[PDB]
Design a protein around this ligand. Structure first.
Ligand code: 2ZL
Ligand code: CL
Ligand code: ZN
Length: 495
């Protein structure tokens, strides 16, 4: 277990000795991201914003993560008024702005979120530039390769949560009848299209395998290439250069300490090699689907924006998502709306970076607090559908159903466009549907209650569910909405 630390240490001996105090501080920052301090955030708030925050039901919000909710709730307690022991519209906007300022400074998370596209205007300019400087300086530190003397004499190990690659499959990976076992069925789906993988940040790996901690059932075993650059962090730990490619050599179920884990064997290869495979796939899926949809042969509609560790599945699931899409929506509705999207250079974007870092969003969303990360998104200004692979939509079974919901937004767009082409608007912004929403808006899904646009898209998704039960359910519980959507569909195919 410890017999190989010494020769890695000696290999990087000069490198470790020549490390500046600033270099060391940088590596330390990379390993331990800087959390926000409660008192710092509290003191920065005005007296009215303090009074507002302490009245807000934080757990009610839908855009705040678990982590962000807990931190804010702790602020509420520390803020002390007279009642202290010895969501609205105003409150939503406040929380959306405050969210941006309670994020820890996390270099590896910034790289993963952006997929290396660190110029993406998804964070405040000042911290965005600081990330850039740090990342550049880290790249400069990681200059010594593992070399021909050691690349095939060691394995590098990493434990990983399944939710990092796929939170959808991750919800069922563990056997529900026995948590020491892996669900063999869910295992097969995870492994099926896992052929390659990309690291856009700095992998922190060990020379000897280490016990998995909470919620880690994936145990990576990695061989580097001679050219792979790295740094020694002592204690048998390495930090690897960013932007490296990984070919998946084997995925197997293994037993350790009477618990079942998933072994992932991977070989480091040039990232350019993997990116070539992705481009050929984008070239292929576009040629295939232009023919199916009857689009011009030169149309670029489908785009792969992938940069992270489950890369091959993002590509392959695009074929599956679109097939289900074509199978559950009538062909003539699909042709009309897709052509409208294409007419505005709209895209179907499949990605494993967070959606605020997708150009088809942030180009038309300067306000960072108005930017959105989710499983799926539709942006009318760019007429694009965005689908985020790794995440898991709350109250949403799979990616295909998410996509259909997003296509509902597109249907919403085109229908409203047909009513008035130069003064274009959403059909859900018309008084007629607003009235329908005010009456039936609470009769479908919980999220459907949010606004007219989401109610429409939810009603649309459910109307095209493979479950013949759910369709009837929408007709019964939201008859006016059901009728309205069918009316728009008729309006579209006759246009
Ligand atoms: C139910 C459902 C959700 C999403 S989603 O990606 O998860 N989503 C809504 C949301 C996000 C966060 C917290 C709660 C809800 C986004 C915002 C959505 O409406 N897409 O157009 C996409 C598609 C879909 F059908
Ligand atoms: Cl093994
Ligand atoms: Zn939506």
């Amino acid at each position: 277990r410890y017999e190989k630390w010494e020769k890695i240490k000696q290999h990087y001996q000069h490198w470790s000795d020549s490390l500046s105090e600033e270099g060391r501080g940088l590596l330390k920052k990379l390993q331990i991201p800087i959390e926000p301090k409660k008192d710092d955030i509290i003191h920065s708030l005005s007296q009215e914003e303090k009074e507002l925050l302490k009245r807000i039901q934080i757990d009610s919000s839908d855009f705040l993560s678990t982590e962000e909710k807990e931190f804010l709730k702790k602020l509420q307690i520390d803020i002390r008024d007279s009642l202290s022991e010895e969501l609205s519209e105003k409150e939503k906007e406040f929380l959306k702005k405050l969210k941006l300022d309670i994020q820890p400074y996390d270099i590896n998370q910034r790289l993963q979120d952006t997929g290396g596209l660190i110029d993406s205007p998804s964070i405040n300019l000042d911290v965005r530039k600081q990330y850039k400087r740090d990342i550049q300086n880290i790249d400069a530190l990681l200059h010594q390769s593992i070399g021909s003397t050691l690349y095939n004499k060691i394995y590098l190990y990493e434990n990983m949560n399944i939710n990092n690659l796929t939170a959808t499959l991750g919800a069922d990976l563990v056997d529900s009848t026995d948590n020491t076992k892996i669900n063999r069925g869910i295992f097969n789906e995870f492994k099926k299209n896992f052929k390659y993988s990309i690291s856009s940040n700095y992998m922190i790996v060990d020379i000897n395998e280490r016990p998995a901690l909470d919620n880690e059932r994936l145990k990576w075993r990695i061989q580097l290439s001679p050219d792979t650059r790295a740094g020694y962090l002592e204690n048998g730990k390495l930090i690897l250069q960013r932007n490296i490619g990984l070919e998946i050599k084997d995925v197997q179920i293994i037993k350790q300490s009477e618990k079942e884990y998933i072994r992932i064997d991977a070989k480091v290869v040039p990232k350019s090699k993997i990116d070539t495979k992705i481009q050929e796939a984008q070239l292929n899926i576009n040629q295939e689907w232009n023919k199916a949809l009857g689009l011009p042969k030169y149309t670029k509609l489908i785009t792969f924006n992938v940069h992270n560790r489950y890369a091959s599945n993002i590509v392959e699931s695009a074929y599956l998502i679109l097939n289900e899409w074509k199978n559950n929506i009538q062909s003539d509705l699909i042709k009309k709306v897709t052509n409208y999207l294409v007419d505005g250079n709209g895209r179907f974007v499949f990605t494993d970076i967070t959606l605020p870092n997708i150009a088809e969003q942030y180009t038309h969303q300067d306000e960072i607090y108005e930017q959105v990360h989710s499983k799926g998104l539709y942006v009318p200004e760019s007429r694009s559908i965005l689908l985020h692979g790794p995440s898991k939509g709350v109250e949403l079974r799979n990616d295909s159903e998410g996509f259909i919901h997003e296509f509902g937004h597109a249907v919403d767009d085109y229908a409203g466009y047909l009513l008035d082409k130069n003064q274009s608007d959403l059909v859900t912004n018309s008084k007629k549907f607003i009235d329908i929403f005010k009456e039936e808006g609470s009769n479908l899904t919980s999220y459907g209650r949010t606004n007219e646009a989401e109610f429409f898209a939810e009603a649309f998704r459910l109307m095209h569910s493979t479950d013949h039960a759910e369709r009837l359910k929408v007709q019964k519980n939201a008859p006016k909405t059901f009728q309205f959507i069918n009316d728009q569909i008729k309006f579209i195919i006759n246009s």
